Amino acid sequence: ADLEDNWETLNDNLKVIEKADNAAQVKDALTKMRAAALDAQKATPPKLEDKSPDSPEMKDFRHGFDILVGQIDDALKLANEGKVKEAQAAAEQLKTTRNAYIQKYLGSGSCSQKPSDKHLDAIPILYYIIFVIGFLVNIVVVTLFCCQKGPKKVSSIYIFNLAVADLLLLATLPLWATYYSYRYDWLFGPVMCKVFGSFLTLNMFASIFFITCMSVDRYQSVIYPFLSQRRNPWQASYIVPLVWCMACLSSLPTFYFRDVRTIEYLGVNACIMAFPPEKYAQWSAGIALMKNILGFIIPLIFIATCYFGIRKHLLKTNSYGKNRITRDQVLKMAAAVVLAFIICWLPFHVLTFLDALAWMGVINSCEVIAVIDLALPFAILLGFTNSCVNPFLYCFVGNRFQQKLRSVFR
Numbered sequence: 232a233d234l235e236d237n238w239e240t241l242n243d244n245l246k247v248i249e250k251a252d253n254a255a256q257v258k259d260a261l262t263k264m265r266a267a268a269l270d271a272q273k274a275t276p277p278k279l280e281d282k283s284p285d286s287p288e289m290k291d292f293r294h295g296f297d298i299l300v301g302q303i304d305d306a307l308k309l310a311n312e313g314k315v316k317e318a319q320a321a322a323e324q325l326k327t328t329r330n331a332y333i334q335k336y337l338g339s340g341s342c343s344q345k346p347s348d349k350h351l352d353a354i355p356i357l358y359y360i361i362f363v364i365g366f367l368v369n370i371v372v373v374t375l376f377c378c379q380k381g382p383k384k385v386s387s388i389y390i391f392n393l394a395v396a397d398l399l400l401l402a403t404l405p406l407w408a409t410y411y412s413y414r415y416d417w418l419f420g421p422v423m424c425k426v427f428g429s430f431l432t433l434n435m436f437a438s439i440f441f442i443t444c445m446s447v448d449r450y451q452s453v454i455y456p457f458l459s460q461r462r463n464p465w466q467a468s469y470i471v472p473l474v475w476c477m478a479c480l481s482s483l484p485t486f487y488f489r490d491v492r493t494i495e496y497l498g499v500n501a502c503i504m505a506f507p508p509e510k511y512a513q514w515s516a517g518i519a520l521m522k523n524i525l526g527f528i529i530p531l532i533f534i535a536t537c538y539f540g541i542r543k544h545l546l547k548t549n550s551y552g553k554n555r556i557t558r559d560q561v562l563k564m565a566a567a568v569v570l571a572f573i574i575c576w577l578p579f580h581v582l583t584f585l586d587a588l589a590w591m592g593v594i595n596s597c598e599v600i601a602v603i604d605l606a607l608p609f610a611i612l613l614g615f616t617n618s619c620v621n622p623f624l625y626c627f628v629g630n631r632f633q634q635k636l637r638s639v640f641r
């Protein structure tokens with residue numbers, strides 16, 4: 232009777248046809264699917280709930296099941312004729328109609344306006360602007376560590392590692408700009424959908440985690456000033472491989488779920504997160520929650536604790552003259568890294584959380600969902616913009632941070 236119960240019946244019986252031996256097992260599973268499809272056709276989905284049945288989107292919902300019943304009948308005729316393997320092969324087309332429903336009515340397909348007025352759009356233009364700016368500033372930091380500075384100092388190792396993680400992350404921007412321009416048509420294959428997808432997640436986490444390491448190292452330098460006096464930076468050689476391995480382990484679900492799947496309504500081959508279709512909404516909300524916790528929640532708490540910790544040790548001294556001037560300058564540099572992390576990542580994680588609620592069934596309003604969809608590529612751009620801000624805050628401007636920290640300590 233219920234829409235959730237009807238789609239559970241449709242998915243469970245699709246697996247039965249695959250495991251079926253004779254025509255009787257195929258006929259039984261198709262009849263159960265035929266009854267569930269006509270029952271779901273009568274029901275109203277959580278999305279577009281406050282809409283009349285005469286509406287074109289409601290007419291399209293009923294028509295979606297008319298294609299499904301028509302496809303069931305074609306396979307049922309082969310099953311009634313004795314053709315077992317032919318009916319099972321015909322039942323593979325039902326999976327395409329099933330995937331069309333999860334993309335349109337469970338996803339943002341029916342809400343967001345599909346027609347795209349692509350004529351040198353702002354997204355590919357802004358993506359290439361951030362690319363060349365970010366690539367040029369990060370190349371300077373990488374080339375400086377190679378033949379202009381050296382491999383000395385604890386903090387300096389993290390500067391180079393953050394610059395490499397940022398450079399490789401910004402290097403993926405021309406791919407996404409081309410991917411956007413072709414109306415989400417992945418022209419690299421299902422193998423490169425996993426490769427580029429994981430490479431993006433790996434370098435993104437490596438960037439975020441090295442920012443976290445910088446905050447911990449900056450905090451440790453204040454509370455324990457004896458650490459900088461140490462001739463040997465023993466922990467640095469073990470922290471760097473651990474962070475890269477943590478970024479690799481975090482990019483594992485990306486390598487497992489990313490795959491090129493055909494979008495039935497758009498008529499495009501998109502590199503999407505191919506979760507099990509029977510529990511697609513649950514997986515989409517779970518991974519979106521994982522994005523917020525691991526990529527924003529845990530690092531922001533670490534970055535803030537380190538900032539308030541430096542503020543606690545500095546403000547209790549009650550300085551006068553140049554000691555007060557140099558103190559305030561250190562506090563402005565320490566606040567700049569926490570502020571830049573918020574401005575650049577908060578819009579994305581808020582929209583990711585709002586999108587997670589849309590999958591669960593909390594946000595069903597198409598007006599809200601349409602805004603989330605068009606704002607998302609701009610929010611993604613802000614995440615990449617953090618990689619352009621990083622060389623300035625840590626290498627260029629943040630070079631006098633260690634000198635001013637040694638000035639207040641004398």
Ligand SMILES: CCc1nc2ccc(N(Cc3ccccc3)C(=O)c3cccs3)cc2c(=O)n1Cc1ccc(-c2ccccc2-c2nn[nH]n2)cc1
Binds near residue numbers: 432485607611
């Ligand atoms: C700034 C970094 C970034 N660049 C991106 C570039 C492009 C896109 N888009 C949408 C797009 C395409 C073209 C133009 C504009 C938008 C895509 O379709 C693809 C992404 C990966 C392969 S295709 C998304 C992102 C994007 O969400 N992010 C942030 C981010 C957040 C979370 C995770 C993550 C964490 C843990 C577990 C899994 C994931 C995970 N999310 N998506 N796949 N894997 C990874 C990356």
